[PDB]
Design a protein around this ligand. Structure first.
Ligand SMILES: *Cc1c(COP(=O)(O)O)cnc(C)c1O
Ligand SMILES: *Cc1c(COP(=O)(O)O)cnc(C)c1O
Lengths: 333, 333
């Protein structure tokens, strides 16, 4: 049959649940040139993003979301069946998914009790690893990785593996970005997106920030015209000075609402513990989380269960929405 | 250094030149929901395309162009370093590019003198091949593959490999589509696009038509949200009844202009031979093609050199544009 021909690995492969900005920001097309193929790397988007991130244009690569960026790094550096990828659970699921789909080995070193890196465990499992992913701030936990530890991770992998900092939520704590470290570390790569703070998840637009040599290797493995013209168009508009300003206003409004939500949740009986976050979502441990999860779910309040993630039993991840959405969750709880 | 960490294979990896519709067809967004992630396979687009192609909705897969479709088939069926892909030159370059990028072997059996398939050579090289690509009408030659030979190819691979018919130009000769053969062949897959006749190359929207079992395996290897909301939006509009009608009008206008261009070129001294085409481009052999190519190029008339393709020495591929664009080429020649 048909499935027997498939690769073995392939044969076995209120909305507050996806970390999206709660409100739609309107945009309209300005470039009616849809009959022609777009440029491989839209100049307007790349230059606007480089100014925003404070890096050189030659250190930026635009792709179909940060998700494509994760895949590209594996495609360029890992030899299937020979090389490995390393990540530290509980974290973003796409790292393992892309590697498993591609047929590359996954090495996992779970983080310590406070979600920080187990530097000793990592140094013991580096042999044969080509790419290390580290999400900071981490999804779903919400916290930043100590920069001192990132320095250690960078020293450990110097000339052995590429270290990828997933900064999908860096807009909520801009001061913590490692974008300024590129000059010191040739093997450091950073993933950025327009899907979260930028309120543009529907666009599927992301970026990889790395030194020119890395960017050039990634250009060799990326699809010929990765971005559509309508996406490049809207993206350049959102990356304009006025757009960066409107973005910052969105972040500020989300942080204020996040602080209200944390304060209120800490007063609710069933809520055992609320963890600090530097993002647009809150991880909280509940007494009988599955019961509470199904209850809200039936009420039409959709969260994200994390009960099955390593060390997250009892936890649910709540995305920060509007004041009215927060009130619905509080009242419901 | 950084490159030493890259995979070996990766380390070594008037506009009438890209087969685009000459005129821009205008479209505007109707869905302002950009803050939320899009559905994995937009229902409107898939149902509209299924009605258009006359297939079941469960036999359609939408991707970032037919180019992504080519990649998906290799990712689902070919084991890197073990399985092979087979194509017949001179043809579309992306087949080999995707395989080489992924690390899968390429087996080539050039076509016969009339560009038809060498069935005996193919049957001799099938061992270890999982996917066979066949472009019909062929790019850059312009002709259709004899359906009798496709039947033979389908029998040869029955239960051994997937046969992919690249129908990127099928809108110019709708009667020749193999979309109706799906019921008889479980291993047949078809690639379609909105980049050529549909005048929407800037959208990066393509489709794969195959039996449900194949489609399901491809769903397992495709990126989670392959299509952006603005693309899904415009694509559903272009696939509406009125849009299919406007599309057909475009095809008719292109075919009439193509016939004029062929007639006129056959009268030009430097033009040694003009080959018949069932598409929106014309392959022609010239006396001193490089000299003619550079000359037009300096004049601002951009064609596509094919001089280096197997059996195409002296040939240039001319995309059919507007009446004024055809006149510029004729006069220039
Ligand atoms: C949302 C997210 C991404 C990917 O974003 P896209 O640009 O939508 O692909 C990557 N990493 C983390 C941790 C995320 O939460
Ligand atoms: C244009 C073309 C494609 C790909 O089209 P997209 O939808 O733009 O990726 C595939 N095959 C052939 C032969 C083509 O000419």
């Amino acid at each position: 049959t048909i499935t027997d021909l498939a690769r073995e690995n392939v044969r076995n492969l209120v909305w507050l649940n996806a970390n999206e900005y709660p409100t739609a920001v309107e945009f309209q097309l300005t470039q009616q040139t849809l009959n022609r193929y777009p440029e491989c790397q839209p100049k307007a988007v790349i230059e606007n993003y480089a100014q925003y991130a404070g890096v050189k244009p030659e250190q930026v690569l635009v792709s179909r979301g940060a998700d494509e960026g994760i895949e590209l790094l594996i495609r360029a550096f890992c030899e299937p069946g020979k090389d490995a990828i390393l990540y530290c659970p509980p974290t973003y699921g796409m790292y393992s998914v892309s590697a498993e789909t591609i047929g590359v080995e996954c090495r996992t070193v779970p983080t310590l009790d406070n979600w920080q890196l187990d530097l000793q465990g990592i140094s013991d499992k580096l042999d044969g690893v080509k790419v290390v992913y580290v999400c900071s701030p981490n999804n779903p936990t919400g916290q930043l990785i100590n920069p001192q530890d990132f320095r250690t991770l960078l020293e450990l992998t110097r000339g052995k593996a590429i270290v990828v900092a997933d900064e999908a939520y860096i807009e909520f704590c801009p001061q913590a970005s490692l974008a300024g470290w590129l000059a010191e570390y040739p093997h450091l790569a950073i993933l950025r997106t327009l899907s979260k703070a930028f309120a543009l998840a529907g666009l599927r637009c992301g970026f990889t920030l790395a030194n020119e040599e890395v960017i050039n290797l990634l250009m060799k493995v990326i699809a010929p015209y990765p971005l559509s013209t309508p996406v490049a168009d809207i993206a350049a508009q959102a990356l304009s000075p006025q757009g960066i300003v409107a973005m910052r206003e969105r972040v500020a409004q989300i942080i204020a609402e996040r602080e209200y939500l944390i304060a209120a949740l800490k007063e609710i009986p069933c809520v055992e513990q609320v963890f600090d976050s530097e993002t647009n979502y809150i991880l909280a441990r509940f007494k009988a989380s599955s019961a509470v999860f199904k209850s809200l779910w039936d009420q039409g309040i959709i969260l994200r269960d994390q009960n099955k993630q390593p060390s997250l039993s009892g936890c649910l991840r709540i995305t920060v929405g509007t004041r009215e959405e927060s009130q619905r969750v509080i009242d419901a709880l």
